[PDB]
């Protein structure tokens, strides 16, 4: 009924194959077993052999072992030197042939297995391997928006593969399960943080039994399970009056609630929470504050060991249009910034890329360096809500890694965000990253079929921020459409130029927005422009732009370290990709490209169609290399993305024609 | 449960009562016995008097006589030159005090005992009456936009009295046939233009004993019921390939459906058809023409007298906004026009009152007069779609006489729209008005108390299109509020100045729209400037306005008779309060009145802004003169208003500053 993505394990010639006679699998544990399958079924797929799977080494055999450093005979000083406990060391033996992986825990020899196998899948010679690798993330998660009527909110890959008809839809969630561990993601949280009324019981005995089930698919595979909640559940599910958390019979009621999941699910991560963001009830509600509410959440989960992800994702969405001194981009840091240091140590709290709301472009979180006493994880999108919805093509992981290596200069140079979420920078106990699922029901899980590029780069990127976009895409492609080096070099440039592709005739140098209002999909640079949500572009007639210096503007600016800030401040220095994020500027100003702004406007959007009619006909120059059902799945989208970015040109084009009045430079077609 | 509306019947004082000691009803059909149950009612409640309902006159009681011509011991010269059926004749006798009510059929003696009520709640002198009274239009209909899930399409008033569930809910029924039958109404849809998949079935056996049921009692109030179909039923319930009306076995199947329901129903009214518009399945989707599409219907319920209500909202709801040859406006009579002469004489053709959709202020639609050998009816929207959703009051009844006075030319001078519609100027068989209902399950029906109003006049208008706004609004504010003097002339001044008021802080001159999408509710002025609908205004930073000229537009105006034509056609002649529907113009043009034409913008938002406020001043001196739970109903729905007129007029005000760049005259605030 779907496709394996990544995990093909194709068949290999007869000049690629591998020799082995057993398995030795040192544990029997579900995540033992989990791999050993892995393995048997990888190896039965691509070599055609079936080992036999053993406790024991046979000193003849050829082998692979399977085991944590205690089941080791002699432990030797690679595998010594493993400090994370989901860190592995992968070794041929130099003496019958063996590869050795070594896991700290069951979950390291499981990631272990998929390493190992993704080296097969890629055809790299094993004879002689020396591999160690340990996570830089603690928490690697996914975020599903899935409701249990079957719809996902900003899904656009097909309907829930979790629930059905107010209800718990086995097999495709342990197929799920498996690319979710074959790139190293340990956590999920499986319902919308905007929790309705009946994933509220997803906390009830009436649910639990269904959601041990699934999490007991997902522990198999490394995976913990987390629950979005109701802030206000003690009063909609518990009959109390009230969801203040300092009253004492609240405090009791998720006490209790705590203890309940916990009989069902030994292991539970915890709770994701959007509290007091759109119309979502929390402490604000009762004149509290966030530490108060989380803490009260973090104390019914303590005992257990459980986590409270608080999303930072909170401003005035009731914000007046022609009130210019605030600024939804300052809304997060103002809002969480003073209360560094009054959070619970099992406190996280989860913060967007960007200030706003997963626009194309965003300046990078100011939260983020600003917090040395609170636990932060990044929340990213892989869902393409605003990154053209699946119908588009947007390889998101360039734009991660910017965000990554964004240096905040905190503790001074070396300040990346990505030190700040590994929690090196500040030693935090638990931090990472979380993106929200860009999965459904469709066969090819992600709606286009090269979107799961984006599911499978997260991973990768969550295991370790340092990897390449352009490694990843090779083994991203390699895995799904094969090592012919046309289709290779292809789909990876498709891939690495898509982003700023779709920049070019979405909005521009930073500013956000222009779409329509509601589903969000496609041109309307006035869609949001005299709304309530502080989504602001201010175009008129002579200029464009939002003002966030403090010389002159809201002062957001400030919220960097100085480094940054006197970057972003000046007119001069702001660099070109965000100056309408920062400064409101003429139509005639210059950048540092030598382009005015409308200039820059027309020539991004007429070459970024053409550069689509490129993307569509590099791929059509795959045909015969790719099996017809892919090749067709992806050139229909290609398609629909050329004529929708022709629709976005000329729409955002004449919007600017009719209000500058400055003519395209080159006299292209503008209606 | 629910207001009485206008039908209050409120007990007079001792000094205004009369003396009455016997009804004479001459017949006992279900008619005659509403008619009678009404007058035990009203002078019940009104004159604490319970006259005993007799068959044969007293010749010394005083009396009120009920009767037809034939039922008359002698036939008087008045009632004498009765020619319509549901005309009557009211007249005291000048000998015992008599008042006879006689109708040329049982419906007139209905009508003629509301007319005789009303008067009474008038305090009117009936010592001498003398009155004849005979409608105008034949049909005088509503149409109800209600769902069977109880939602209702563009319904503002509350959910469906008709419909819950996905079935039928009948009191609250006869409360409302009793509403419509005292102003006239004689004709009624129940279902949504827009037959969703339930609603369908509405024409099977599975849902005929309901609609029979409710139909029954809309009989006994002389209205006849009518249902909305579904085009492709012989698809979706009829088990056939296709829906093409020149298929036999469609053609088939649609007299079987008809001899089916007027085996329930026998007077049963007919079928009203959107068909071909806004994604709704019609003949054109196999190559048919509208004639061939409504003639086969007609020809299913032309044995049993029934009529095809074929709706003329047609357009391309899928025009590219950079094609400015293409023009809705355009769009109905081009379709219709050249089929004039090949419809089926039991077809009408239901135009609504301009040809773009229920704007704040449209031209007249160019089919009225356009079509000598085709029946056609008008259609209005009495719920507030565009004018204000009954959160803002909006009295229709002067918008909806200015289209009736328009003089269409079509046979010289004295060609109005009335004498269109009333069959007069063409000698129409069946021909009249329609209007969208605009009540719901709020318990004061309409969800402003005010737009009791426009379900009132437009019964009235219906009725006779001569009589004038001022006395309508007359009648209803006695009837519904009492005779106080300062009460009277305060609400109808509200009523009758409503109109312009909400006209001057929305759309300027005409153009229209400037809503925001998807519910239509509030200032967006680009809100569907860049989309598929056809409704643009084209601002840019020197003007405004669609060229819809034949010298150099679209060509629109040649759709009126000359003398409308040229009026329209050239820009020094074109009224003001159209100008932008017809030419593009600078901002800087001068209009009529003296002002630039960005200048009457700003005049008319900052004005319309104050304009409410006087509103709802006005209506708060009648503190103590109204009941408090009215009172305050009513003005917690100006306070709404007024500031939801602000914020029209600021959105408006502000994007024509950042377009023109000209500042107000007077300096006012613009943000
Ligand atoms: O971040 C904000 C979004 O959460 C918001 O989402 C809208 C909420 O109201 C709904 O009815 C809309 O359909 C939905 O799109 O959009 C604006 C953005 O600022
Ligand atoms: O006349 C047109 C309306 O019928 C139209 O209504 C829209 C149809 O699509 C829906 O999803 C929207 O919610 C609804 O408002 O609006 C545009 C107008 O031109
Ligand atoms: C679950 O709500 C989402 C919302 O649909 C989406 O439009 C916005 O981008 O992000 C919100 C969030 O991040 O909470
Ligand atoms: C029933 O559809 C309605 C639609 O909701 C409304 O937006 C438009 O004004 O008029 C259509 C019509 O008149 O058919």
Redesign the interface.
Known sequence: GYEPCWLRYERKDQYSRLRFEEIVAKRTSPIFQAAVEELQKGLRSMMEIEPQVVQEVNETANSIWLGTLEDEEFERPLEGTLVHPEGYVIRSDVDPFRIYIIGKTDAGVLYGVFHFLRLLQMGENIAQLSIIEQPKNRLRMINHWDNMDGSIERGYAGRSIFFVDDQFVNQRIKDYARLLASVGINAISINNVNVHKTETKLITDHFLPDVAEVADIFRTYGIKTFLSINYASPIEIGGLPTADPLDPEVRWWWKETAKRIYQYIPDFGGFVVKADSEFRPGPFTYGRDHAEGANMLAEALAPFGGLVIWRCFVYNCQQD??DRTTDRAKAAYDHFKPLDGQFRENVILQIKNGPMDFQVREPVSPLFGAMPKTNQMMEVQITQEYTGQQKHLCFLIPQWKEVLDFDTYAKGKGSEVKKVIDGSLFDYRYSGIAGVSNIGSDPNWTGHTLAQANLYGFGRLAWNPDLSAEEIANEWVVQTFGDDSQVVETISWMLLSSWRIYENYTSPLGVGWMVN??HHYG????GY??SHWGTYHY????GIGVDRTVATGTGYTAQYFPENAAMYESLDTCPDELLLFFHHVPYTHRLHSGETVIQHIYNTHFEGVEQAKQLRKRWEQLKGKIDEKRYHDVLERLTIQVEHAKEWR??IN??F?????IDDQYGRKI?
Chains 1, 2 share one sequence.
């Open positions: 249009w022609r209002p509601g041109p309307n640079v006035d422009e005299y175009a008129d007639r002579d000329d729409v004449t919007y024609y009719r209000k500058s009045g209606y």
